[PDB]
Structure 1
């Protein structure tokens, strides 16, 4: 359900796994390498950000924008009003792109393997699956994330 406790747990684990400095770029590159290995076809949806070359400034800038979205969103997990306003802002940016909601399921799987892989053994997968649902639901609206 992603109650307040799980939200706190997830904020804590994200912070540790996200890190400082360039470790964030590394985290992001891992997250996106996993997304494209999980769903090789999702890569085509990003021609606008030059996904042909993942190490290109255009795509790296995209990686930065996404993990920055994850960061600000997770940081607002404790304030419903701020959280929902931002999730709608994100939805507005993703709708005109007509994206298959299933991709967001793959993204979450990648998010978990990346945060878990960095955080280590005490990673709380159930908490993350539940709270990630809130994000996905807030961005896509597809009740598949209900």
Structure 2
């Protein structure tokens, strides 16, 4: 799935919901709040970013880098060459950690709830689910995102 029309629709819905400046920090804050509320045990996998307190600038920096990379991956949805080249780069960065692939599931559920509630009712969930599988498959490589 994840055709070109869905890719372009995802970019327009992401760019609107993401915002710029102060809105980006508050956007990524609610997503990780959902991640820690959906999967409470995944919080202690980030002791290296001072995730004990979500307000710490070490975790605020971790939020910025993660959603920032998600912003740059979504921006390359149209072009496959650099998308896959970056998905592979993120793969070779996350694979050494050896993380559970079920967290990328929880990541999408939090992203859908965060983008959907911020974008509004016209949130295209099937398009976001289909195109999120492309991202998680490029990072995890796990068959879980077929």
Q: Same fold (TM over 0.5)?
A: yes
What is the CA deviation profile of residues 26-53 of structure 1, one whole-angstrom value per residue up to 9, with x for unaligned ones? 0000010000000000001101111101
TM-score, normalised with respect to structure 2: 0.99
Q: Deviations over 1:55-78 (max 9, x none)?
A: 101000000001101100000000
Structure 2: runs of 5+ lacking an equivalent = none
The runs of 4+ residues in structure 1 deviating greater than 2 Å are none
Name the CA distance, whole Å, in 1 between partners of 2:66 and 2:29.
11
Distance, in Å, in 2 between the alignment partners of 1:94 and 1:140 is 8
Give distance in 1, aligned partners of 2:20 and 2:97.
32
Q: Partner of 1:41: helix, strand, or coil?
A: helix
CA-based RMSD: 0.5
Give 1:20 deviation, angstroms: 1.3
Unaligned stretches of 5+ in structure 1? none
C-alpha displacement at 1:12, in angstroms? 0.5
Deviation at 1:93, TM superposition (A): 1.1
Count of residues in Structure 1 that have an aligned counterpart in Structure 2: 146
The separation in 2 between residues aligned to 1:67 and 1:101, in whole angstroms, is: 18
CA apart distance, 1:16: 0.3
